[PDB]
Design a binder for this molecule. Structure first.
Ligand SMILES: *C\C=C(C)/C=C/C=C(C)/C=C/C1=C(C)CCCC1(C)C
Ligand SMILES: CCCCCCCCCCCCCCCC
Ligand SMILES: CCCCCCCCCCCCCCCC
Ligand SMILES: CCCCCCCCCCCCCCCC
Ligand SMILES: CCCCCCCCCCCCCCCC
Ligand SMILES: CCCCCCCCCCCCCCCC
Ligand SMILES: CCCCCCCCCCCC
Ligand SMILES: CCCCCCCCC
Ligand SMILES: CCCCCCCCC
Ligand SMILES: CCCCCCCCC
Ligand SMILES: CCCCCCCCC
Ligand SMILES: CCCCCCCCC
Ligand SMILES: [Ca+2]
Ligand SMILES: [Cl-]
Ligand SMILES: [Cl-]
Ligand SMILES: [Cl-]
Ligand code: NA
Length: 241
């Protein structure tokens, strides 16, 4: 794999995992310190949700860097590396990012349940695909997971967008800018997976780990930076509970 075997354990992708860990930690601490000076009850909710996004990713990246949760999946003559913490991270952080968007939109708890349930199914079926032992199974689960992603993104772009519009320009503009980021960046994930080690195998583990690290940092720290600097986070919220 393209990279550098930092820990001397035969894993050049640790260069990227290590850089990812550092960036996630810096982002977590930045949001934490910025949050300490926030008093508005709504803004504090966005900070709490958002700090946890690079925070949990920090833990996952540190895990992966040290090789905790790494195994091999047999696919014919090949043995493909799977990091469980990648999927566990996404399982927690994608619902948190969706909750940020749902708070902005001020949508009801059944809408939120639908959005996060389909998102959880997306991640679970991606994991099943990653653990599957035939190409046909891996591609099939990938397709199912991708359909789930399209459903999530469609809900964001329609139902939540229309709800956010009613909340006036500040909220609408922030919702729209973050949704623009999400529709593009999230779609990059299935593309990378299917061209990479889990799918067609064009892109190797090194380049793939690098690019997932860039996507992760952008979709977590980048997203959070954009959200938390906005006046929209001062607007009234209604948590699902
Ligand atoms: C770290 C934060 C984010 C935004 C992660 C997003 C992850 C996905 C959108 C993953 C999607 C997948 C699909 C649609 C198909 C199977 C392969 C994936 C699990 C990578
Ligand atoms: C104004 C001070 C900024 C401090 C932010 C620290 C976070 C560093 C992590 C890098 C995140 C890059 C996101 C990419 C955006 C497209
Ligand atoms: C209170 C109004 C919101 C109603 C939302 C529920 C709609 C049902 C959609 C179910 C989506 C599951 C599809 C699974 C992914 C292929
Ligand atoms: C010789 C291979 C054995 C038979 C396997 C065929 C499975 C094909 C199913 C494809 C599932 C697509 C998921 C998308 C949701 C409709
Ligand atoms: C209103 C449309 C909602 C559904 C959109 C789902 C797919 C998003 C399309 C964006 C494609 C980005 C490609 C980037 C290639 C690097
Ligand atoms: C001998 C070891 C060579 C190390 C070369 C590292 C290349 C540059 C590191 C930056 C990686 C991209 C960061 C993306 C930020 C989100
Ligand atoms: C509204 C309701 C969910 C519809 C999902 C459409 C996704 C395919 C485009
Ligand atoms: C032999 C040690 C290589 C360290 C790579 C660091 C690259 C800068 C981010
Ligand atoms: C613990 C964080 C690991 C950092 C490794 C160095 C990356 C360049
Ligand atoms: C309050 C800082 C972020 C906490 C992240 C939780 C996961 C770490 C194990
Ligand atoms: C919750 C953080 C996971 C990383 C553990 C580090 C163990 C080093 C051997
Ligand atoms: C062969 C694996 C089938 C996956 C089922 C997706 C709906
Ligand atoms: Ca307020
Ligand atoms: Cl405040
Ligand atoms: Cl207040
Ligand atoms: Cl590679
Ligand atoms: Na290493």
């Amino acid at each position: 794999q393209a990279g550098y075997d930092l820990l001397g354990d035969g894993r050049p992708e640790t260069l990227w995992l290590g850089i990812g860990t550092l960036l996630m930690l810096i982002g977590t601490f930045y949001f934490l310190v910025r949050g300490w000076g926030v008093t508005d009850k709504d803004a504090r909710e966005y900070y709490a949700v958002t700090i946890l996004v690079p925070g949990i990713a920090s833990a996952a990246y540190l895990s992966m860097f040290f090789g905790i949760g790494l195994t091999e999946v047999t696919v014919g003559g090949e043995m493909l590396d799977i990091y469980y913490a990648r999927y566990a991270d996404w399982l927690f952080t994608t619902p948190l990012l969706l909750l940020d968007l749902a708070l902005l939109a001020k949508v009801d708890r059944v809408t939120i349940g639908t959005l996060v349930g389909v998102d959880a199914l997306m991640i679970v079926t991606g994991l099943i695909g990653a653990l599957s032992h035939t190409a046909i199974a891996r591609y099939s689960w990938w397709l199912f997971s991708t359909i789930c992603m399209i459903v999530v993104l469609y809900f964001l772009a329609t139902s939540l967008r229309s709800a956010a519009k009613e909340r006036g320009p500040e909220v609408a503009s922030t919702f729209n800018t973050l949704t623009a980021l999400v529709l593009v960046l999230w779609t990059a994930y299935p593309i990378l997976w299917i061209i990479g080690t889990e799918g067609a195998g064009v892109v190797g583990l090194g380049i793939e780990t690098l690019l997932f690290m860039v996507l992760d940092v952008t979709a977590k720290v980048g997203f959070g930076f954009i959200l938390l600097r906005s006046r929209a986070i001062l607007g009234d919220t209604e948590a699902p509970e």
